Structure 1
């Protein structure tokens, strides 16, 4: 419980940072910077944008190595400690 809360806050902050950077350095709209941050950390990849500035490319490299771990951690616990029980409870005859 408190674990998922911590991972949630950590993820929120990680995304906020991405939103602020890509909207300031790469000139994206707040919503687009968020989207790029999300698809990047989850490794989906954005097909409509790639960092154009060397500053953006360097940041993304570091942003990736530092973000993917905690992002998938959240996704992990989000599924295991939240998504799993809900479906099991719905099954119970």
Structure 2
């Protein structure tokens, strides 16, 4: 479950990294950063796609990727960190 969500999240971010570095001309690290803050809804106060292709892709990217990213964040906290933390709580 967590493994699959992990892989799915990685593939989604790779796609965004490739798209923004190609179409919007961002350095790969910047394309990855933008992809991450966009899908987690944090957003960036500096960059917004400048091309119409970038704007359309971003719209579709958000709708398709938000659900996945938060499902992963969910399991990552309830199925990976909760126990690890809740474990020590045990005297």
Q: TM-score normalised to the size of structure 1?
A: 0.97
Q: TM-score normalised to the size of structure 2?
A: 0.99
Could you report, residue by residue, the CA deviation over 1:16-75 in whole angstroms, capped at 9, with x for unpaired residues?
000000000000000000000000000000111000000000000000000000000000
Distance 1:81 1:75 in 2: 10
Residue 91 of structure 1 deviates from its aligned partner by: 1.1
What SS class does the counterpart of residue 47 from structure 1 fall into? coil
Segments of 5+ residues of structure 1 without an aligned counterpart are none
Aligned residues: 91
Aligned-pair Cα RMSD in Å: 0.4
